[PDB]
Point group: D2
Chain length 106, copies 4
């Protein structure tokens, strides 16, 4: 999937989680988020088109995905344990990682 589509998948599923009634819905969403974040790994964002892959900027760009992936991984544990409110909080909190990357690279 292209970068924009993975980003839409991340946005859609954060909202699903916010509004979720049960653990299954939160798990399903976090699962789709993980897959989207992992597929985005390799993408070159428009603002860095003129920079190579091994470029310093691209390393720092990709670093935000390691952070996101890790927060997704741990939130899915909280959902697996039926700790719905807790998993919803972890999801709300990882917005800071979304925002930081957008602020610098969108």
């Amino acid at each position: 999937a292209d970068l924009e589509d993975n980003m839409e998948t991340l946005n859609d599923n954060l909202k699903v989680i916010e509004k979720a009634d049960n653990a299954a819905q939160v798990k399903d969403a976090l699962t789709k988020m993980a897959a989207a974040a992992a597929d985005a790994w390799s993408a070159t964002p428009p603002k860095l088109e003129d920079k190579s892959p091994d470029s310093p900027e691209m390393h720092d760009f990709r670093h935000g995905f390691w952070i996101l992936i890790g927060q997704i991984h741990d939130a899915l544990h909280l959902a697996n344990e039926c700790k719905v409110k807790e998993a919803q909080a972890a999801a709300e909190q990882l917005k800071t990682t979304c925002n930081a990357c957008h602020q610098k690279y969108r």
Copy 2:
């Protein structure tokens, strides 16, 4: 790329790290490994081909890559700090993750 080729990227780059003389070499190899781990995320392994994308087995299989990716993330920081020896040890330590997945799923 396919799962086999991602494994070859992981294997190859690990020996590069093993034998490397400087930080830049280790950084480049970890970067390639991180892309290959992320790309592997959604692969279905030959031995789980009778299991569904949402099944305990496929969740456990992907969990192994969350762990791998985490370890590669940290190892790159060590490489970035030019802590080459400490980076090669992390790369050695994460081989436990490679092998753990293999024993269960290869």
Copy 3:
């Protein structure tokens, strides 16, 4: 040290980081936060003094420290890399973790 004293140390050093114009000062402050956060691990806050040490509340309280500890760990690598602004932003970001625990447990 007690929990209040660890909280003062976390806060005081977060302010040092915000004010800092160099990596050395951010590193040192992140190091002291790490120590304060690990020392707070086993504290029982007043609002949970009526709860079992194995309660879901107490497990969730300690989980907030795990999150904080890992955010400090990553920010410190950023600081070791002389990514002064990126380390400051990470420190800014982990305030969400401080805020979340406080709102539930203080």
Copy 4:
């Protein structure tokens, strides 16, 4: 507690995790190991007393506890999801981290 006593707690609990019959027994042991590893954070090992608190050795020593704490955290989630063989597997894998530290500093 002092470094030696926390190391006893780490070692005793590992062996309890080995032999455990149920998830409750693994959860409880891992909880105890988390606390022991967090309490050990600050400790100056005998082999490094003559080093500065901000020497590379001490930074590296503390780093190993970050790695250990994150691994205990993840295993505890597996134990809480009743994935007892997977939590036992994760626990017995900790020894990669235990051994690496002992090799350099014990």
